[model samples]
Target: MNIVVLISGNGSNLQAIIDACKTNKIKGTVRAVFSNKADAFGLERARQAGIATHTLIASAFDSREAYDRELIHEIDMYAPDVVVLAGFMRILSPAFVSHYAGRLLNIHPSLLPKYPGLHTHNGDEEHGTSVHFVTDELDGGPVILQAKVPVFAGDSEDDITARVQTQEHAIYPLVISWFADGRLKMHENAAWLDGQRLPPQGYA
Candidate 1:
């Protein structure tokens, strides 16, 4: 599988994907890494892995649609089988989502259906991560997989994030491995694994 990863800031998730690919956990190649920030440290991670990298600032374009169009064109250049959004902060336009429907994926910090947007750290209940398909609705796509980590008593935001991040590193690559092995698919507006329909919350 040809995978393209998108990032915005510090790329702990990106690094996880790269390490998974290198150790044959993902069973695919990370064709490229693209970032909206010119100084995204993820670019260096890609370079160290000898993968291609590109940066396209949204402000450089006149409008969001224009930037998305150019971004789509650039991503298409690599003919990626799957585009993984690993901490990519930009909100994609509807056209961009439609262009790669069922193939674009994202990982969010919260377990989802609880905290869809930012500030997920404010919650004190169950904490973990979710990997899902990207759609026009913000973080409202079908989930592929999820791993839960309990929020400890008196745990701070950083503490919760660190614990959840460990699971994030595991689940993201597991879902991508499913994609690479041809056991994952999109059907009836949901994710299907090995001919079985996945639940709304996905596997544990």
Candidate 2:
């Protein structure tokens, strides 16, 4: 399977995916990496891995929809079987979501449903990360995989983030491998793993 990853920040998750692919853990190739910010460190990570990179600035286009249209064009060029939004910060337009639909995926820093949008920095026992299908709703898609991490007594915001990120690195690649191995699919707007319909919150 060919994969295309999108990012907006440091892209530690992106690096994890790249490393997993290199080690044959992902069972697929990263065809390209796209970013809205030209200076995203994720682009550098992709370049170092010899993967293709594209920077699509929203400011370069008159509107978000216009930018999304072009973004779709660029992504389709690679004929990706999976488009992973590692950290792409933009709230996608409905049209963009429909275009990719079940083929798109995202990794959110929180356990989700509890903290859909930002402000996921808080929390203790329930802290973790999630890999889910991308939909028109913001982080409201069906989950594929998730893992919990403990929030230590003295944990700060950075500490919690790092803990969640560690799980993100593991879960994201595992979910992608499931896709590549044909053990994962979407049916009736829900995730199906190994012929079993996954719950809304997905497997641990």
Candidate 3:
């Protein structure tokens, strides 16, 4: 399968996917990477790997939809089979989401369902849960996979995120592998893991 990864930040998750691709841990090849910001570190990462990269600044466009249309135009040119939303901070329009639908997958900081938006590590701390689910809508999509990390009594925001990131590195590539190998399937709005239901509750 041909894949395109989207990003807007440091792109540690993007690194994870690249590492997976390099080691032949996943079947799909990263055809390109798209960034809304030219300064995103992920763009550099993609350059290092010799993958094609495109920058489509949202601020250059009039509306969010217009920006997304530009993004979609670039992405569609690649004819990617899967679009990986790794640290791509923008909330996509329903039209954009619908364009890719089941082929779009994102990795969220929180376990999910619990915290749907930014500052997820802190949000999880405030709300209090050792383990959580990752959703599709700002982390509200159907839970595809999750890993639990113990939140210590004196843990800082970085502490929790560091641990969660370890899990993200592991889970993201594995999930993408499943998608590439035909071991995973998306029916309706939910993803099936190894032919089993990936409920909203996720692996927890």
What TM-score would every model get versus the actual structure?
0.92, 0.93, 0.85
lDDT of 3 by residue, 1-204 (tens): 888999998888888998898899999799999888888988988999999999888678999889888888889888988899888888888788888877888776655435322344333342212111123455466767767666666766676667778878888898888788887767766667777876675653
> Which stretches of model 2 miss by more than 4 angstroms?
115-124
- Residue 87 of model 1 has an lDDT of 94
How far does residue 103 in candidate 1 sit from its true spot (Å)? 0.7
TM-score of 1: 0.92
Candidate number with the higher TM-score (2 or 3)? 2
Residue-level lDDT of model 2, residues 74-177, one tens digit each, is: 99999999999999999889998889888899988777656322445344467778899988768878899888778667877777777778889989999999
* Cα misplacement distance, residue 178 of candidate 3 (Å): 0.4
Candidate 3 CA-lDDT value: 0.75
Pairs in clash, predicted candidate 1: none
What value does the lDDT take at residue 78 in candidate 3?
87
CA-only RMSD, every prediction: 2.3, 2.2, 3.8
